Symmetry: C3
Subunit: 193 residues, 3 copies
Amino acid sequence: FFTAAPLSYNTGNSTISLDYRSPQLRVSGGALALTSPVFVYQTPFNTPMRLRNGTYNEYADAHIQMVRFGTTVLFNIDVTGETNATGTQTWELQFDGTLGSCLTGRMQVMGGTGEELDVTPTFILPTSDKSVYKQGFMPIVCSENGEFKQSTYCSYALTYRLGNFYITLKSTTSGCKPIFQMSFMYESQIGIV
Amino acid sequence: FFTAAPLSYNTGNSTISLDYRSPQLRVSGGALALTSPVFVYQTPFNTPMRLRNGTYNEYADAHIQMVRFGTTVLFNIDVTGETNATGTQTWELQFDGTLGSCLTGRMQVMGGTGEELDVTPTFILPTSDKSVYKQGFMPIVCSENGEFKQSTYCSYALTYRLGNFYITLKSTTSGCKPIFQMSFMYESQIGIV
Amino acid sequence: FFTAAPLSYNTGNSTISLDYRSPQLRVSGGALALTSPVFVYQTPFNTPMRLRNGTYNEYADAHIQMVRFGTTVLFNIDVTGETNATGTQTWELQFDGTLGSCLTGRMQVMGGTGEELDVTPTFILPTSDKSVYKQGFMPIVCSENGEFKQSTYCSYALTYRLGNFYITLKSTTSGCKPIFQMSFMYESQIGIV
Ligand SMILES: CC(=O)N[C@@H]1[C@@H](O)[C@H](O)[C@@H](CO)O[C@H]1O
Ligand SMILES: CC(=O)N[C@@H]1[C@@H](O)[C@H](O)[C@@H](CO)O[C@H]1O
Ligand SMILES: CC(=O)N[C@@H]1[C@@H](O)[C@H](O)[C@@H](CO)O[C@H]1O
Protein backbone atom coordinates (compact mmCIF):
# COMPACT_ATOMS: atom_id res chain seq x y z
CA PHE A 1 0.00 0.00 0.00
CA PHE A 2 0.86 3.71 -0.17
CA THR A 3 0.55 6.40 2.52
CA ALA A 4 -0.52 9.92 1.52
CA ALA A 5 0.84 12.84 3.55
CA PRO A 6 0.54 13.55 6.42
CA LEU A 7 0.92 9.76 6.88
CA SER A 8 4.48 8.56 6.05
CA TYR A 9 6.04 5.08 5.82
CA ASN A 10 9.53 4.36 7.13
CA THR A 11 11.01 1.57 5.00
CA GLY A 12 13.97 1.35 7.44
CA ASN A 13 11.66 -0.14 10.12
CA SER A 14 8.21 -0.85 8.50
CA THR A 15 6.55 1.93 10.56
CA ILE A 16 3.59 4.10 9.55
CA SER A 17 3.72 7.55 11.16
CA LEU A 18 1.73 10.79 11.21
CA ASP A 19 3.91 13.78 10.42
CA TYR A 20 2.82 16.94 12.28
CA ARG A 21 4.19 20.45 12.97
CA SER A 22 5.28 20.23 16.64
CA PRO A 23 4.68 23.90 17.57
CA GLN A 24 0.99 23.36 16.67
CA LEU A 25 0.27 19.66 17.39
CA ARG A 26 1.65 17.10 19.87
CA VAL A 27 1.30 13.63 21.38
CA SER A 28 0.06 13.23 24.92
CA GLY A 29 -0.45 9.81 26.47
CA GLY A 30 -0.34 8.20 23.00
CA ALA A 31 -2.99 10.45 21.45
CA LEU A 32 -2.91 13.49 19.19
CA ALA A 33 -3.52 16.85 20.88
CA LEU A 34 -2.94 20.56 20.26
CA THR A 35 -0.04 22.57 21.64
CA SER A 36 -2.27 25.64 22.30
CA PRO A 37 -5.88 24.44 22.38
CA VAL A 38 -8.70 26.92 22.90
CA PHE A 39 -10.67 26.12 26.07
CA VAL A 40 -13.55 28.24 27.33
CA TYR A 41 -15.06 28.03 30.80
CA GLN A 42 -18.39 29.83 30.68
CA THR A 43 -21.92 30.26 31.91
CA PRO A 44 -24.23 28.04 29.80
CA PHE A 45 -26.37 29.30 26.91
CA ASN A 46 -29.45 31.06 28.41
CA THR A 47 -28.27 30.37 31.96
CA PRO A 48 -26.71 33.56 33.35
CA MET A 49 -25.19 33.33 36.82
CA ARG A 50 -27.13 34.98 39.66
CA LEU A 51 -24.84 37.22 41.71
CA ARG A 52 -25.39 39.08 44.99
CA ASN A 53 -23.75 42.40 45.95
CA GLY A 54 -22.21 41.22 49.28
CA THR A 55 -24.79 41.19 52.12
CA TYR A 56 -27.15 43.63 50.36
CA ASN A 57 -30.49 42.53 48.82
CA GLU A 58 -29.09 43.65 45.41
CA TYR A 59 -28.84 40.93 42.77
CA ALA A 60 -27.61 40.78 39.12
CA ASP A 61 -27.43 38.37 36.18
CA ALA A 62 -23.96 37.72 34.77
CA HIS A 63 -22.81 35.95 31.57
CA ILE A 64 -19.14 34.97 31.95
CA GLN A 65 -16.50 33.59 29.58
CA MET A 66 -12.95 32.67 30.56
CA VAL A 67 -10.94 31.88 27.43
CA ARG A 68 -7.61 30.16 27.39
CA PHE A 69 -5.29 31.25 24.51
CA GLY A 70 -1.87 29.67 25.00
CA THR A 71 -1.25 30.34 28.71
CA THR A 72 -3.26 33.60 28.80
CA VAL A 73 -6.85 33.84 30.03
CA LEU A 74 -9.20 36.41 28.48
CA PHE A 75 -12.00 37.14 31.05
CA ASN A 76 -15.27 38.66 29.87
CA ILE A 77 -18.33 39.48 31.94
CA ASP A 78 -21.65 40.95 31.02
CA VAL A 79 -23.51 42.22 34.17
CA THR A 80 -27.19 43.21 34.30
CA GLY A 81 -28.04 44.60 37.73
CA GLU A 82 -31.70 44.96 38.73
CA THR A 83 -31.34 47.85 41.20
CA ASN A 84 -30.66 51.49 40.48
CA ALA A 85 -27.78 52.33 42.74
CA THR A 86 -25.37 54.99 43.95
CA GLY A 87 -22.21 53.40 45.37
CA THR A 88 -19.81 50.56 44.62
CA GLN A 89 -21.12 47.00 44.16
CA THR A 90 -18.94 43.95 44.80
CA TRP A 91 -19.43 41.03 42.40
CA GLU A 92 -17.27 38.14 43.65
CA LEU A 93 -16.52 34.86 41.88
CA GLN A 94 -14.86 31.92 43.70
CA PHE A 95 -13.17 28.92 42.16
CA ASP A 96 -11.76 25.75 43.75
CA GLY A 97 -8.01 26.33 44.02
CA THR A 98 -7.14 22.80 42.87
CA LEU A 99 -9.76 21.88 40.30
CA GLY A 100 -10.90 25.32 39.11
CA SER A 101 -14.63 24.57 39.55
CA CYS A 102 -16.72 27.69 39.99
CA LEU A 103 -18.18 27.69 43.52
CA THR A 104 -20.30 30.81 42.96
CA GLY A 105 -22.56 29.37 40.22
CA ARG A 106 -22.96 27.03 37.25
CA MET A 107 -20.15 27.20 34.67
CA GLN A 108 -18.97 24.68 32.10
CA VAL A 109 -16.20 23.96 29.67
CA MET A 110 -17.81 24.46 26.24
CA GLY A 111 -16.55 23.45 22.79
CA GLY A 112 -17.02 25.39 19.55
CA THR A 113 -19.48 22.63 18.69
CA GLY A 114 -21.82 24.06 21.36
CA GLU A 115 -21.40 20.89 23.49
CA GLU A 116 -20.22 20.64 27.10
CA LEU A 117 -16.71 19.08 27.38
CA ASP A 118 -15.79 16.59 30.12
CA VAL A 119 -12.75 18.55 31.28
CA THR A 120 -11.64 19.69 34.76
CA PRO A 121 -11.20 23.51 34.50
CA THR A 122 -7.71 23.78 36.09
CA PHE A 123 -6.77 25.98 33.08
CA ILE A 124 -8.34 29.15 34.57
CA LEU A 125 -6.10 29.00 37.67
CA PRO A 126 -3.22 31.53 37.82
CA THR A 127 -0.67 29.40 39.78
CA SER A 128 -0.31 25.87 41.17
CA ASP A 129 1.25 27.42 44.35
CA LYS A 130 -1.94 29.42 45.22
CA SER A 131 -0.62 32.97 45.31
CA VAL A 132 -1.32 35.90 42.94
CA TYR A 133 -1.23 39.69 42.73
CA LYS A 134 -3.25 41.19 39.97
CA GLN A 135 -5.49 44.19 40.16
CA GLY A 136 -6.56 47.06 37.97
CA PHE A 137 -9.55 49.00 36.66
CA MET A 138 -11.29 49.04 33.32
CA PRO A 139 -13.46 51.85 31.99
CA ILE A 140 -17.14 50.91 31.51
CA VAL A 141 -20.30 52.55 30.27
CA CYS A 142 -23.58 51.80 32.06
CA SER A 143 -26.76 51.93 30.01
CA GLU A 144 -30.36 50.72 30.06
CA ASN A 145 -32.66 49.84 27.12
CA GLY A 146 -30.29 51.47 24.60
CA GLU A 147 -29.91 54.71 26.60
CA PHE A 148 -26.54 56.03 27.84
CA LYS A 149 -26.47 56.41 31.68
CA GLN A 150 -22.90 56.86 32.89
CA SER A 151 -19.22 56.55 31.99
CA THR A 152 -17.52 55.02 34.95
CA TYR A 153 -15.20 52.18 35.95
CA CYS A 154 -15.00 48.68 37.38
CA SER A 155 -12.08 47.20 39.32
CA TYR A 156 -10.87 43.62 39.10
CA ALA A 157 -8.68 41.79 41.63
CA LEU A 158 -7.25 38.27 41.55
CA THR A 159 -6.49 36.71 44.94
CA TYR A 160 -6.33 33.44 46.83
CA ARG A 161 -7.79 32.78 50.25
CA LEU A 162 -8.46 29.54 52.14
CA GLY A 163 -6.81 27.84 49.16
CA ASN A 164 -9.39 29.08 46.60
CA PHE A 165 -9.06 31.50 43.69
CA TYR A 166 -11.13 34.70 43.74
CA ILE A 167 -11.91 37.18 40.98
CA THR A 168 -13.49 40.16 42.71
CA LEU A 169 -15.08 42.84 40.53
CA LYS A 170 -16.25 46.23 41.81
CA SER A 171 -18.49 48.54 39.77
CA THR A 172 -19.09 52.16 40.75
CA THR A 173 -22.45 53.73 39.77
CA SER A 174 -24.27 56.98 40.30
CA GLY A 175 -28.07 56.78 40.11
CA CYS A 176 -28.15 53.95 37.55
CA LYS A 177 -28.32 50.19 37.34
CA PRO A 178 -24.95 48.44 36.95
CA ILE A 179 -25.45 47.15 33.41
CA PHE A 180 -22.15 46.81 31.55
CA GLN A 181 -19.62 44.59 29.80
CA MET A 182 -15.98 44.46 30.92
CA SER A 183 -13.00 42.29 29.94
CA PHE A 184 -9.37 41.94 30.98
CA MET A 185 -6.49 39.47 30.53
CA TYR A 186 -4.41 37.51 33.03
CA GLU A 187 -1.84 34.72 32.87
CA SER A 188 -1.96 31.05 33.96
CA GLN A 189 1.17 28.98 34.68
CA ILE A 190 -0.97 25.81 34.68
CA GLY A 191 -0.03 23.89 31.53
CA ILE A 192 -2.59 22.02 29.43
CA VAL A 193 -0.88 18.65 28.92
CA PHE B 1 4.00 -3.17 9.42
CA PHE B 2 4.06 -1.19 12.72
CA THR B 3 2.39 2.07 13.91
CA ALA B 4 3.99 4.94 15.79
CA ALA B 5 1.77 6.97 18.18
CA PRO B 6 -0.71 8.69 17.74
CA LEU B 7 -1.55 5.98 15.18
CA SER B 8 -2.53 2.56 16.58
CA TYR B 9 -2.90 -0.91 15.06
CA ASN B 10 -5.34 -3.34 16.76
CA THR B 11 -4.32 -6.96 15.94
CA GLY B 12 -7.61 -8.03 17.59
CA ASN B 13 -9.83 -6.62 14.82
CA SER B 14 -6.99 -5.86 12.37
CA THR B 15 -7.83 -2.16 12.47
CA ILE B 16 -5.61 0.92 12.20
CA SER B 17 -6.86 4.04 14.04
CA LEU B 18 -5.89 7.58 15.03
CA ASP B 19 -5.93 8.17 18.80
CA TYR B 20 -6.86 11.75 19.69
CA ARG B 21 -7.82 13.81 22.78
CA SER B 22 -11.60 14.19 22.43
CA PRO B 23 -11.96 17.54 24.22
CA GLN B 24 -9.50 19.00 21.64
CA LEU B 25 -10.14 17.00 18.45
CA ARG B 26 -13.11 15.24 16.87
CA VAL B 27 -14.52 13.56 13.77
CA SER B 28 -16.99 15.42 11.53
CA GLY B 29 -18.52 13.29 8.77
CA GLY B 30 -15.52 10.94 8.82
CA ALA B 31 -12.92 13.77 8.85
CA LEU B 32 -10.63 15.03 11.59
CA ALA B 33 -11.60 18.45 12.97
CA LEU B 34 -11.06 20.59 16.10
CA THR B 35 -13.49 20.78 19.01
CA SER B 36 -12.78 24.56 19.34
CA PRO B 37 -11.42 25.96 16.08
CA VAL B 38 -10.64 29.65 15.65
CA PHE B 39 -12.45 31.26 12.70
CA VAL B 40 -12.22 34.94 11.72
CA TYR B 41 -14.73 36.77 9.46
CA GLN B 42 -13.12 40.04 8.45
CA THR B 43 -12.77 42.86 5.97
CA PRO B 44 -9.95 41.88 3.57
CA PHE B 45 -6.36 43.11 4.14
CA ASN B 46 -6.24 46.79 3.20
CA THR B 47 -9.86 46.64 1.97
CA PRO B 48 -11.87 48.54 4.52
CA MET B 49 -15.61 48.70 4.15
CA ARG B 50 -17.42 51.93 3.33
CA LEU B 51 -20.09 52.83 5.89
CA ARG B 52 -22.70 55.59 5.63
CA ASN B 53 -24.18 57.40 8.63
CA GLY B 54 -27.86 56.74 7.97
CA THR B 55 -29.24 59.10 5.37
CA TYR B 56 -26.65 61.79 6.11
CA ASN B 57 -23.96 62.59 3.54
CA GLU B 58 -21.36 61.29 6.00
CA TYR B 59 -19.10 58.28 5.56
CA ALA B 60 -16.39 56.26 7.29
CA ASP B 61 -13.98 53.51 6.36
CA ALA B 62 -14.14 50.42 8.59
CA HIS B 63 -11.84 47.49 9.23
CA ILE B 64 -13.81 44.69 10.97
CA GLN B 65 -12.73 41.42 12.56
CA MET B 66 -15.27 38.99 14.02
CA VAL B 67 -13.20 36.40 15.84
CA ARG B 68 -14.95 33.17 16.82
CA PHE B 69 -13.59 30.99 19.64
CA GLY B 70 -15.60 28.37 21.48
CA THR B 71 -19.14 29.81 21.26
CA THR B 72 -18.05 33.45 21.62
CA VAL B 73 -17.61 36.18 19.00
CA LEU B 74 -15.15 38.98 19.63
CA PHE B 75 -16.24 41.86 17.40
CA ASN B 76 -13.57 44.47 16.71
CA ILE B 77 -14.04 47.55 14.53
CA ASP B 78 -11.75 50.29 13.39
CA VAL B 79 -13.85 53.27 12.29
CA THR B 80 -12.31 56.23 10.43
CA GLY B 81 -14.96 58.90 9.86
CA GLU B 82 -14.44 61.83 7.50
CA THR B 83 -16.90 64.48 8.68
CA ASN B 84 -16.48 66.56 11.84
CA ALA B 85 -19.74 66.16 13.66
CA THR B 86 -21.74 66.97 16.76
CA GLY B 87 -24.47 64.35 17.34
CA THR B 88 -24.78 60.59 17.17
CA GLN B 89 -23.85 58.62 14.04
CA THR B 90 -25.46 55.31 13.12
CA TRP B 91 -23.29 52.64 11.52
CA GLU B 92 -25.40 49.61 10.58
CA LEU B 93 -24.00 46.24 9.51
CA GLN B 94 -26.37 43.73 7.90
CA PHE B 95 -25.73 39.99 7.52
CA ASP B 96 -27.73 37.21 5.82
CA GLY B 97 -29.88 35.72 8.63
CA THR B 98 -29.17 32.10 7.58
CA LEU B 99 -25.68 32.15 6.00
CA GLY B 100 -24.04 35.05 7.94
CA SER B 101 -22.69 36.70 4.70
CA CYS B 102 -22.19 40.44 5.12
CA LEU B 103 -24.47 42.42 2.82
CA THR B 104 -23.19 45.87 3.85
CA GLY B 105 -19.67 45.23 2.44
CA ARG B 106 -17.09 42.60 1.49
CA MET B 107 -15.99 40.22 4.24
CA GLN B 108 -14.18 36.87 4.04
CA VAL B 109 -13.39 33.96 6.32
CA MET B 110 -9.59 34.26 6.68
CA GLY B 111 -7.29 31.48 7.92
CA GLY B 112 -4.02 31.96 9.85
CA THR B 113 -2.28 31.14 6.59
CA GLY B 114 -3.48 34.45 5.12
CA GLU B 115 -5.74 32.59 2.64
CA GLU B 116 -9.49 32.97 2.28
CA LEU B 117 -11.37 29.88 3.47
CA ASP B 118 -14.35 28.46 1.58
CA VAL B 119 -16.62 28.48 4.62
CA THR B 120 -20.15 29.74 5.10
CA PRO B 121 -19.88 32.31 7.98
CA THR B 122 -22.90 31.01 10.00
CA PHE B 123 -20.55 31.13 13.06
CA ILE B 124 -21.17 34.88 13.56
CA LEU B 125 -24.95 34.49 13.89
CA PRO B 126 -26.30 34.71 17.44
CA THR B 127 -29.02 32.03 16.88
CA SER B 128 -30.77 30.32 13.92
CA ASP B 129 -34.46 30.34 14.94
CA LYS B 130 -34.88 32.50 18.04
CA SER B 131 -35.50 36.26 17.85
CA VAL B 132 -32.74 38.25 19.56
CA TYR B 133 -32.23 41.76 20.82
CA LYS B 134 -29.12 42.76 22.82
CA GLN B 135 -27.62 46.21 23.47
CA GLY B 136 -24.78 47.73 25.41
CA PHE B 137 -22.27 50.59 25.31
CA MET B 138 -18.48 50.72 25.33
CA PRO B 139 -16.21 53.69 26.09
CA ILE B 140 -14.19 55.03 23.15
CA VAL B 141 -11.63 57.71 22.45
CA CYS B 142 -11.96 59.78 19.25
CA SER B 143 -8.60 60.98 17.86
CA GLU B 144 -7.17 62.38 14.62
CA ASN B 145 -3.61 62.13 13.26
CA GLY B 146 -2.28 60.88 16.59
CA GLU B 147 -3.96 63.71 18.52
CA PHE B 148 -6.58 63.18 21.28
CA LYS B 149 -10.03 64.67 20.47
CA GLN B 150 -12.69 63.33 22.90
CA SER B 151 -13.41 60.57 25.46
CA THR B 152 -16.93 59.42 24.57
CA TYR B 153 -19.02 56.29 23.94
CA CYS B 154 -20.42 53.98 21.26
CA SER B 155 -23.46 51.70 21.65
CA TYR B 156 -23.82 48.30 20.02
CA ALA B 157 -27.09 46.54 19.25
CA LEU B 158 -27.72 43.00 17.93
CA THR B 159 -31.17 42.56 16.31
CA TYR B 160 -32.57 39.40 14.67
CA ARG B 161 -36.11 38.12 14.05
CA LEU B 162 -35.50 35.51 11.39
CA GLY B 163 -34.81 37.97 8.54
CA ASN B 164 -31.35 39.43 8.45
CA PHE B 165 -28.94 39.82 11.37
CA TYR B 166 -28.06 43.46 12.28
CA ILE B 167 -25.20 44.90 14.28
CA THR B 168 -26.01 48.57 14.82
CA LEU B 169 -23.28 50.86 16.26
CA LYS B 170 -24.01 54.41 17.41
CA SER B 171 -21.09 56.75 18.15
CA THR B 172 -21.67 60.09 19.94
CA THR B 173 -19.30 62.98 19.09
CA SER B 174 -18.89 66.64 19.90
CA GLY B 175 -17.04 68.66 17.24
CA CYS B 176 -14.77 65.88 16.04
CA LYS B 177 -14.62 63.16 13.41
CA PRO B 178 -15.85 59.73 14.55
CA ILE B 179 -12.49 58.00 14.49
CA PHE B 180 -12.09 55.18 17.03
CA GLN B 181 -11.49 51.50 17.75
CA MET B 182 -14.01 49.47 19.71
CA SER B 183 -14.64 45.84 20.61
CA PHE B 184 -17.27 43.81 22.44
CA MET B 185 -18.16 40.16 22.88
CA TYR B 186 -21.31 38.18 22.19
CA GLU B 187 -22.46 34.60 22.17
CA SER B 188 -23.35 32.46 19.13
CA GLN B 189 -25.51 29.35 19.65
CA ILE B 190 -24.48 28.16 16.16
CA GLY B 191 -22.22 25.16 16.83
CA ILE B 192 -19.18 24.69 14.60
CA VAL B 193 -19.50 21.04 13.51
CA PHE C 1 -6.94 -4.84 7.61
CA PHE C 2 -9.52 -2.11 8.28
CA THR C 3 -9.12 1.69 8.66
CA ALA C 4 -11.18 3.56 11.28
CA ALA C 5 -12.30 7.15 10.56
CA PRO C 6 -10.58 9.63 10.18
CA LEU C 7 -8.20 7.14 8.44
CA SER C 8 -9.53 5.83 5.13
CA TYR C 9 -8.27 3.44 2.46
CA ASN C 10 -8.74 4.17 -1.26
CA THR C 11 -9.44 0.85 -2.96
CA GLY C 12 -8.22 1.93 -6.38
CA ASN C 13 -4.79 3.46 -5.70
CA SER C 14 -3.95 1.31 -2.63
CA THR C 15 -3.42 4.47 -0.54
CA ILE C 16 -4.22 5.01 3.15
CA SER C 17 -5.14 8.58 4.04
CA LEU C 18 -6.00 10.90 6.90
CA ASP C 19 -9.24 12.73 6.05
CA TYR C 20 -9.48 16.19 7.69
CA ARG C 21 -11.63 19.33 7.39
CA SER C 22 -9.59 21.82 5.32
CA PRO C 23 -10.95 24.98 6.95
CA GLN C 24 -9.59 23.72 10.35
CA LEU C 25 -6.54 21.58 9.53
CA ARG C 26 -4.03 21.47 6.66
CA VAL C 27 -0.83 19.92 5.34
CA SER C 28 2.41 21.92 4.99
CA GLY C 29 5.61 20.22 3.82
CA GLY C 30 3.88 16.87 4.22
CA ALA C 31 3.12 17.58 7.94
CA LEU C 32 -0.33 18.04 9.61
CA ALA C 33 -0.89 21.57 10.87
CA LEU C 34 -3.76 23.91 11.86
CA THR C 35 -5.32 26.43 9.53
CA SER C 36 -5.67 29.06 12.29
CA PRO C 37 -3.33 28.13 15.12
CA VAL C 38 -3.06 30.18 18.28
CA PHE C 39 0.44 31.61 18.97
CA VAL C 40 1.34 33.92 21.84
CA TYR C 41 4.40 36.14 22.18
CA GLN C 42 4.73 37.33 25.79
CA THR C 43 6.90 38.47 28.66
CA PRO C 44 7.85 35.43 30.78
CA PHE C 45 5.67 34.52 33.77
CA ASN C 46 6.61 36.89 36.61
CA THR C 47 9.41 38.50 34.49
CA PRO C 48 8.09 41.92 33.48
CA MET C 49 9.97 44.11 31.03
CA ARG C 50 11.62 47.34 32.28
CA LEU C 51 10.55 50.42 30.30
CA ARG C 52 11.61 54.03 30.51
CA ASN C 53 9.57 57.13 29.78
CA GLY C 54 11.80 58.40 26.97
CA THR C 55 14.77 60.33 28.47
CA TYR C 56 12.98 61.14 31.79
CA ASN C 57 13.90 59.36 35.04
CA GLU C 58 10.59 57.61 35.10
CA TYR C 59 10.24 53.87 34.71
CA ALA C 60 7.53 51.21 34.52
CA ASP C 61 7.30 47.44 34.68
CA ALA C 62 5.31 45.89 31.83
CA HIS C 63 3.68 42.47 31.32
CA ILE C 64 2.88 42.00 27.63
CA GLN C 65 0.95 39.40 25.61
CA MET C 66 0.59 39.35 21.85
CA VAL C 67 -2.03 36.80 20.81
CA ARG C 68 -2.27 35.73 17.22
CA PHE C 69 -5.55 34.31 15.97
CA GLY C 70 -6.22 33.95 12.29
CA THR C 71 -4.32 36.95 10.92
CA THR C 72 -5.24 39.23 13.84
CA VAL C 73 -3.05 40.17 16.82
CA LEU C 74 -4.58 41.03 20.19
CA PHE C 75 -1.97 43.20 22.01
CA ASN C 76 -2.37 43.43 25.77
CA ILE C 77 -0.15 45.35 28.18
CA ASP C 78 -0.12 45.81 31.96
CA VAL C 79 1.92 48.92 32.73
CA THR C 80 2.98 49.56 36.33
CA GLY C 81 4.61 52.98 36.47
CA GLU C 82 6.61 54.13 39.48
CA THR C 83 6.52 57.93 39.43
CA ASN C 84 3.57 60.29 39.96
CA ALA C 85 3.26 62.50 36.91
CA THR C 86 1.33 65.20 35.13
CA GLY C 87 1.90 64.92 31.39
CA THR C 88 2.17 62.29 28.66
CA GLN C 89 4.66 59.42 29.07
CA THR C 90 6.09 57.54 26.03
CA TRP C 91 6.58 53.75 26.31
CA GLU C 92 8.29 52.20 23.29
CA LEU C 93 8.63 48.59 22.33
CA GLN C 94 11.00 47.64 19.57
CA PHE C 95 10.98 44.45 17.51
CA ASP C 96 13.36 43.06 14.84
CA GLY C 97 11.70 43.93 11.52
CA THR C 98 12.65 40.64 9.88
CA LEU C 99 12.16 38.05 12.67
CA GLY C 100 9.84 39.86 15.16
CA SER C 101 12.22 39.23 18.12
CA CYS C 102 11.67 41.84 20.85
CA LEU C 103 14.75 44.06 21.23
CA THR C 104 13.52 46.12 24.22
CA GLY C 105 13.44 43.19 26.61
CA ARG C 106 12.86 39.47 26.89
CA MET C 107 9.72 37.91 25.36
CA GLN C 108 9.01 34.32 24.31
CA VAL C 109 6.65 32.21 22.19
CA MET C 110 4.71 30.24 24.78
CA GLY C 111 2.49 27.23 24.08
CA GLY C 112 -0.66 26.16 25.96
CA THR C 113 1.44 23.41 27.55
CA GLY C 114 3.49 26.02 29.41
CA GLU C 115 6.56 25.18 27.30
CA GLU C 116 8.47 27.77 25.26
CA LEU C 117 8.10 26.98 21.57
CA ASP C 118 11.02 27.12 19.11
CA VAL C 119 9.37 29.42 16.56
CA THR C 120 10.34 32.77 15.08
CA PRO C 121 7.90 35.49 16.28
CA THR C 122 7.26 36.78 12.71
CA PHE C 123 3.51 36.36 13.36
CA ILE C 124 3.41 39.72 15.27
CA LEU C 125 4.75 41.74 12.28
CA PRO C 126 2.01 43.85 10.69
CA THR C 127 3.17 44.35 7.09
CA SER C 128 5.60 42.28 5.03
CA ASP C 129 6.88 45.36 3.13
CA LYS C 130 7.68 47.55 6.23
CA SER C 131 5.21 50.39 5.52
CA VAL C 132 2.48 50.83 8.16
CA TYR C 133 0.94 53.69 10.17
CA LYS C 134 -1.85 52.30 12.36
CA GLN C 135 -2.61 54.61 15.29
CA GLY C 136 -5.48 55.18 17.73
CA PHE C 137 -6.42 55.79 21.33
CA MET C 138 -7.96 53.59 24.05
CA PRO C 139 -9.66 54.69 27.27
CA ILE C 140 -7.78 53.53 30.40
CA VAL C 141 -8.15 53.87 34.18
CA CYS C 142 -5.15 54.63 36.35
CA SER C 143 -5.30 53.14 39.84
CA GLU C 144 -2.96 52.33 42.73
CA ASN C 145 -3.31 49.56 45.35
CA GLY C 146 -6.90 48.97 44.21
CA GLU C 147 -7.97 52.62 44.55
CA PHE C 148 -9.24 54.59 41.53
CA LYS C 149 -7.07 57.57 40.47
CA GLN C 150 -8.10 58.78 36.99
CA SER C 151 -10.19 58.01 33.86
CA THR C 152 -7.89 58.88 30.98
CA TYR C 153 -6.40 57.64 27.71
CA CYS C 154 -3.44 56.01 26.02
CA SER C 155 -2.43 56.14 22.36
CA TYR C 156 -0.89 53.36 20.34
CA ALA C 157 1.07 53.64 17.11
CA LEU C 158 2.58 50.95 14.91
CA THR C 159 5.48 52.20 12.76
CA TYR C 160 8.74 51.01 11.19
CA ARG C 161 12.01 52.89 11.68
CA LEU C 162 15.45 51.90 10.38
CA GLY C 163 14.01 48.51 9.34
CA ASN C 164 12.58 47.62 12.82
CA PHE C 165 8.95 47.36 14.06
CA TYR C 166 7.82 49.72 16.82
CA ILE C 167 4.75 49.75 19.08
CA THR C 168 4.71 53.15 20.77
CA LEU C 169 2.25 53.82 23.62
CA LYS C 170 1.59 57.26 25.14
CA SER C 171 -0.32 57.42 28.42
CA THR C 172 -1.55 60.77 29.71
CA THR C 173 -1.84 61.35 33.48
CA SER C 174 -2.65 64.08 35.99
CA GLY C 175 -1.16 63.64 39.47
CA CYS C 176 -1.07 59.82 39.47
CA LYS C 177 1.33 57.05 38.54
CA PRO C 178 0.82 55.56 35.06
CA ILE C 179 -0.71 52.24 36.25
CA PHE C 180 -3.17 50.61 33.81
CA GLN C 181 -3.98 47.66 31.54
CA MET C 182 -4.85 48.29 27.88
CA SER C 183 -5.53 46.19 24.81
CA PHE C 184 -5.96 46.81 21.10
CA MET C 185 -6.14 44.74 17.95
CA TYR C 186 -4.34 44.93 14.66
CA GLU C 187 -3.93 42.86 11.50
CA SER C 188 -0.82 40.89 10.47
CA GLN C 189 -0.38 40.26 6.74
CA ILE C 190 2.22 37.55 7.53
CA GLY C 191 0.62 34.18 6.94
CA ILE C 192 1.55 31.25 9.15
CA VAL C 193 2.37 28.57 6.56
C1 LIG D 1 -29.57 51.36 45.96
C2 LIG D 1 -28.17 51.85 46.23
O1 LIG D 1 -27.90 53.04 46.15
N1 LIG D 1 -27.28 50.91 46.54
C3 LIG D 1 -25.84 51.14 46.76
C4 LIG D 1 -25.06 49.83 46.56
O2 LIG D 1 -25.24 49.43 45.20
C5 LIG D 1 -23.57 49.92 46.96
O3 LIG D 1 -22.98 48.60 46.97
C6 LIG D 1 -23.43 50.62 48.35
C7 LIG D 1 -22.01 50.83 48.89
O4 LIG D 1 -21.29 51.66 47.98
O5 LIG D 1 -24.15 51.87 48.36
C8 LIG D 1 -25.56 51.74 48.14
O6 LIG D 1 -26.14 53.04 48.24
C1 LIG E 1 -22.24 67.66 10.62
C2 LIG E 1 -22.83 67.06 11.87
O1 LIG E 1 -22.63 67.58 12.97
N1 LIG E 1 -23.57 65.98 11.67
C3 LIG E 1 -24.35 65.28 12.67
C4 LIG E 1 -24.36 63.77 12.45
O2 LIG E 1 -23.05 63.22 12.51
C5 LIG E 1 -25.33 63.10 13.43
O3 LIG E 1 -25.47 61.78 12.92
C6 LIG E 1 -26.71 63.78 13.44
C7 LIG E 1 -27.77 63.26 14.41
O4 LIG E 1 -27.30 63.35 15.75
O5 LIG E 1 -26.51 65.18 13.69
C8 LIG E 1 -25.80 65.72 12.59
O6 LIG E 1 -25.90 67.10 12.70
C1 LIG F 1 7.05 64.06 37.08
C2 LIG F 1 6.26 64.45 35.87
O1 LIG F 1 5.23 65.08 35.99
N1 LIG F 1 6.76 64.06 34.69
C3 LIG F 1 6.10 64.28 33.41
C4 LIG F 1 6.38 63.09 32.49
O2 LIG F 1 5.77 61.92 33.08
C5 LIG F 1 5.90 63.34 31.06
O3 LIG F 1 6.43 62.31 30.21
C6 LIG F 1 6.37 64.71 30.56
C7 LIG F 1 5.87 65.08 29.17
O4 LIG F 1 4.50 65.45 29.24
O5 LIG F 1 5.96 65.73 31.45
C8 LIG F 1 6.51 65.60 32.76
O6 LIG F 1 5.90 66.65 33.50
